[PDB]
Structure formats: C-alpha cells, structure tokens
Amino acid sequence: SGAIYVGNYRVVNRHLATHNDWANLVWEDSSRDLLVSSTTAQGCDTIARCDCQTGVYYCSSRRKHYPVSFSKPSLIFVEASEYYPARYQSHLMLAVGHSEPGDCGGILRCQHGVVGIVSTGGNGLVGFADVRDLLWLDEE
C-alpha cells in the first residue's frame, strides 16, 4: 500500500483505490495503473520534473529503502496478477529489486522529488508507474 500526497491530490495504484478515492475522483488510467483523488488537507510530497534514471524506492516487505537504477518509462508486458490479466502497461520503469503484492504504492524518488510508485513485481524485478509527465499535479 502507499500513496503520493501532492497539493490537494492523492496518487494511488488504480488497483488499490478505495471507495472514497472513486467517490472523489480526479483522473484514472487503467493502462498506467494510476488513479488520482482529491484531498481536503494539503500534502507534502513534491513531484520530480527531471531525467533521473537512478533513485531510491521504499520496499514495505523489507521495511527498507533501496537505491536502484531504473529504465526509462516504456510500454512493458506484465504477467497476470489478482488485479489485471497479462497485458502491456504504459509509462512503466523496471529495476532489479524485491517487490511482493503488498509492496505496491511504495515511492520511488530522486533528489528532485517523487518519481513514481511501485506497480509491478516478481523474480527480483520491481516496476514503477512514472508520474513525472503529469504536470497538472503541481497546480489547482
């Protein structure tokens, strides 16, 4: 589990969104595994607007933050899970690292801010849904 709290937005994995998220919906995209809902309180996370391909992510199944090198956002094929069939996911970045279902939602960050959240896993890989192109998260 986990979310990004930027401004009056909450960014979560679409497959983990709650009823309150759906009832306060701003934007969702199944191809990216992302959903954004509105919040009453202002958040403290800042979104990275950069070209970093190294950073650190939080792994809940280890209670640890790990440094990683990750690929550029791309269209990748992901195996079936409890939430989606096997398919292509867009704006996904892969790295070598530990990731269980329960680890989705952990933040990937660099010195500039939040880069994305854990969205896929297995066999020593971790995949992150990028948020750096969603410029509108910084306004309204």
Ligand X SMILES: NC(=O)[C@H]1CCCN(C(=O)C[C@@H]2CSCCS2)C1
Tell me, what DSSP letter sits at residue 82? S
Among Zn ion, ligand X, none, residue 37 binds (CB under 5-8 Å by kind): none
Q: Which stretch binds Zn ion (CB under 5 A): 17-25, 38-46, 99-107, 110-118?
A: 110-118
d(C-alpha 119, C-alpha 126), whole Å:
8
Active site residue 91: no
With residue 117 as reference, give the H or E element that holds it: strand 113-122
Name residue 38's amino acid. S
Which of positions 63-92 make contact with ligand X (CB under 6 A)? 78, 81, 83-84, 89
- What is the pairing mode between strands 125-130 and 87-96? antiparallel
Residues in 32-51 that interact with Zn ion by CB under 5 A: 48, 50
Q: Is 33 a catalytic residue?
A: yes
**Residue 51 falls in which region: left (phi positive, over 0), alpha (psi -120 to 50) or beta:** alpha
Contact 107, 58 (CB under 8 A): yes
Closer residue to ligand X, CB minimum distance, 7 or 13: 13
Instruction: Indicate if 44 belongs to the active site.
Output: no
110 touching Zn ion, by CB under 5 A: yes
Residues at the binding site for Zn(2+) are: 50, 52, 110, 112
Chain positions contacting ligand X, by CB under 6 A: 15, 33, 78, 81, 83-84, 89, 99-101, 103-104, 118-122
